[PDB]
Design a protein around this ligand. Sequence first.
Ligand SMILES: [Mg+2]
Ligand SMILES: [Mg+2]
Ligand SMILES: [Mg+2]
Ligand SMILES: [Mg+2]
Ligand SMILES: [Mg+2]
Ligand SMILES: [Mg+2]
Ligand SMILES: [Mg+2]
Ligand SMILES: [Mg+2]
Ligand SMILES: [Mg+2]
Ligand SMILES: [Zn+2]
Lengths: 86, 63, 107, 97, 136, 96, 45, 99, 122, 116
Amino acid sequence: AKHLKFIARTVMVQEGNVESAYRTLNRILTMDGLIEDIKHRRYYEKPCCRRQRESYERCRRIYNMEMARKINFLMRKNRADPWQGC
Amino acid sequence: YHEDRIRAKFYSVYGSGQRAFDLFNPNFKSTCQRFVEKYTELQKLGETDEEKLFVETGKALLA
Amino acid sequence: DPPPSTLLKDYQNVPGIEKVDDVVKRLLSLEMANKKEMLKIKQEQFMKKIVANPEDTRSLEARIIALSVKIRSYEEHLEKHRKDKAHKRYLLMSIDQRKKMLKNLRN
Amino acid sequence: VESFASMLRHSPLTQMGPAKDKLVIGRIFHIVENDLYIDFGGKFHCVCRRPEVDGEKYQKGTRVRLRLLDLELTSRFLGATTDTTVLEANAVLLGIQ
Amino acid sequence: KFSIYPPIPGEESSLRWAGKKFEEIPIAHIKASHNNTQIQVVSASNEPLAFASCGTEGFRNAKKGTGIAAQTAGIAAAARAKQKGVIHIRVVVKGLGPGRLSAMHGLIMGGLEVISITDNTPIPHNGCRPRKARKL
Amino acid sequence: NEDLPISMENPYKEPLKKCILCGKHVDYKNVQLLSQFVSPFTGCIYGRHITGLCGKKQKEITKAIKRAQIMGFMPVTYKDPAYLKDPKVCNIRYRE
Amino acid sequence: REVLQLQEEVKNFITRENLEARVEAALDSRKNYNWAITREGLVVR
Amino acid sequence: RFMEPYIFGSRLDHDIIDLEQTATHLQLALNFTAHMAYRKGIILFISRNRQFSYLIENMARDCGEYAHTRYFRGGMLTNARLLFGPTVRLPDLIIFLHT
Amino acid sequence: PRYELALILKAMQRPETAATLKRTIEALMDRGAIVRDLENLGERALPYRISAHSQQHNRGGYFLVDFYAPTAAVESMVEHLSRDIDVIRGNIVKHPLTQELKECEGIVPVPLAEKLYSTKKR
Amino acid sequence: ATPSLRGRLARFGNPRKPVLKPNKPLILANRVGERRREKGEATCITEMSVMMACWKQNEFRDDACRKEIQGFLDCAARAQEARKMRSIQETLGESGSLLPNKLNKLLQRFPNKPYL
RNA sequence: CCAGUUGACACAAAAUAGACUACGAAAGUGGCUUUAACAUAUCUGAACACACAAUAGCUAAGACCCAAACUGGGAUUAGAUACCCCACUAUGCUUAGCCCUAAACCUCAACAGUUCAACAAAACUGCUCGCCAGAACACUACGAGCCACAGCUUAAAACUCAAAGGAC
Ligand SMILES: [Mg+2]
Ligand SMILES: [Mg+2]
Ligand SMILES: [Mg+2]
Ligand SMILES: [Mg+2]
Ligand SMILES: [Mg+2]
Ligand SMILES: [Mg+2]
Ligand SMILES: [Mg+2]
Ligand SMILES: [Mg+2]
Ligand SMILES: [Mg+2]
Ligand SMILES: [Zn+2]
């Protein structure tokens, strides 16, 4: 009740492919964190707890990035044995 | 080594290493290695400008 | 209490604004700057009136004059917008440093 | 025992300088179960499988051109204060002769 | 092919999708939540006509927020809209819950073609402060 | 003498590793250019490493973006369909 | 040199030759840098 | 840490060892091994990297020395009295081919 | 630092806006504010209006007034601007075109953590 | 890649505020995430729900819900098959990628050398 | 006044970028325009003084839809000033009379530097003040200071014992 709501977060659907637009909207919510925004603004979290949760999320992101890097770096050995002598 | 600048210039002015290098037997020779050896032979004793001799050798090897 | 309207200390050897209109000089005069201009004016005036080697801001006497000018600037700043306690502590530390420097000098 | 300076200067690994986009030719140092670890001097050997275009000429004593890309392959992961080596190179294969 | 942005009738409508401008395609306001839904299918002339609930079927507990009641209400609203002519609509979503995708599937199966999900969820961009934590 | 290893001037030096702003200052008075770094739905900007900018670089860039959003130099709630496609400046994380 | 450059640029601000006409152009004419950019330094709309 | 004196220099994340030090170490080690074999000095090879275990074992076969290029079970040299005989001369020299 | 005004008004006739701009320019020239350029961003207008409080701005222009204020006049200029009527969101700007971002060349490699825990086992 | 953490460390060096406060030992390992399944699924029930709705709208027997009854039968069958396929592929032995233990061993091929 | 497309009234709150780096002795902070912004760069040298407030609270009140101390009405209830649902009173934004205590922790002081009782924020020496070398009594009676009159800086002495505390 302020501006035109037909353009705000209004993804278009092609050939009735509501699944594609819905998946795009869900990916937006997840990446940007709009679902997280709702979950966190719905009720209160102690600023100390908020900063601790932010640090824990940073740690988890670092861990996931390092795991992905290690996987992509060690998947090269998915071949066979080099010598097979001992 | 002193050949670092020579190799840098050779790979910056012209294309990268396209010659087949063996590197098995000691002090192997080919075309790019021969060019590097000629450059080292022409270095120093230049003072004036080494780019002239570089371009001369490049044009002699290519044409 | 240095003068308010004077000329620039850094742009002193530039005759390209003396024989010109008004806006051209205003672009390179005391108008587009801030309190730093008044600080420089006070520094130059007191250095020319006291020490025989002005424009330095490094020597002992120069450092003392710079500290005095900084204290004056902090006082004038606290003269307005008194709702800042960080700047109050800054001025307190400046006064403490002034006392320390004066003691070291006298001793 | 010849000159130590000249020998340390003129050497294959040092003559090739920083291997980067250099087409090197070599042979296979050891037949693999189902790979094609072709050697070519340097610090390490490439790693790949048998290509679909002519994959029989590769013998213990052949000459096939390589590309040489990243002779180190290392990366500090998370807490490992040191490096994690792999003893490989990984390069794009060209062909035969 | 096919611009992702919706051309509002003002700035700027240029095509006629099945002989219907963007304004000719009504809205499908829906209150998606874990409890109930309030469907609203507008007409081509910008006039509401449809409005179905969940408890009217027979349930009164939390079963209204499930997908069954949402789909039934969506089908009823689609039928009420087609009774006078609507066909095309603009899917909308307000809140989170099982009635989110269920309502969309019901609207799609009700004979109405979707062309732009004009969902307007309540995302207070730095507004209402958080409240006391409660078990959700 | 010359055949011994002697640290030279460290050759093989790449020029200034410029990201995208090599020498073109983006203007803060446009629709397409200013929205390129913003989502045309919720008004979100992409990550720092996604754009490839440095610290102060992306910091001031997003500061100016928010200044344009607030002061009234770019629509925040969404984007007008007039400016349809957008060049691939910031690697879009959705749709793709 | 900087003072000379500033004196020369002062004439490029709002000279007397473009006072009311400048306001009229600003209120009616257009003079914007409406140009988009990509990953590199390329001009495009 | 203790490898820094030997490591003379590096070539872009590639260490280079002085040839003189390596040659002297080789001379000393080979002289010691020869003078030990001069009294039936049981030399022991080790190479679990599998890079050249075949060739090392073949060379050990051609010579009179032995190799331990396999897993180290419950004490092969410190507790060699149970898995083997009681009176068994242990190796007086171990040449780690690939430690 | 330098200043920059972006007067955002509506397309209300024309002579009134011209007279207002003339009066503002004359006042700025008589006081002590040097005006740089009086460019314009055309008749562009945001697709969405403002949450005004206390007006309704649909279509409007973007008349720039790149000016430079000294020190003891920003408040007077803000008051003169508020004295207007049809204004979307009056907000002076600091000239950022001349000097770009801070002094920073290009990207640098992120350093890796060196010994964050005791060497034991964990 | 990783966030800044040089100065922001609770050590004797930089006396800045610590940002990364890892409650767990931030040390890489050679083990993939924990294997899990079955907790609060309750999925693949739309066919059963629509069948029950069709049956309630009619009576008790199958007279105008043959499509619904066959859909419910196929849904039960496919739900059993999907639970089995989940427990198999999505947990242990996959068909298209590597296995959990296989990836664990692949990571263990090159563990770490933190003691220098 | 429930779902809003044509719009509406707060001293609110910083949607991804915030993955960014800073100053301040430390509190302390991130959506925006402006006034003024980073003290000495040899260090320390008052817990008998100039000042901050971490969060909160007494007094005079302004004051934000938005929160709770006082809250009613109901799962469960055997016994619930919390839990599961609605908002509200001192207080969150502002000027003054005030205890300045904390986990004001990064429990690791500033400079000169050099190369593991256990948990581990690696080891080795100088510089300056502060700390203690019986716990429960003892963040307390009493004494000295504070416009607190539920408290703050310090804060002891009796009967009991083999202590007591931390790690592994
Ligand atoms: Mg933990
Ligand atoms: Mg001290
Ligand atoms: Mg003292
Ligand atoms: Mg306080
Ligand atoms: Mg309340
Ligand atoms: Mg209240
Ligand atoms: Mg506030
Ligand atoms: Mg204290
Ligand atoms: Mg504390
Ligand atoms: Zn850049």
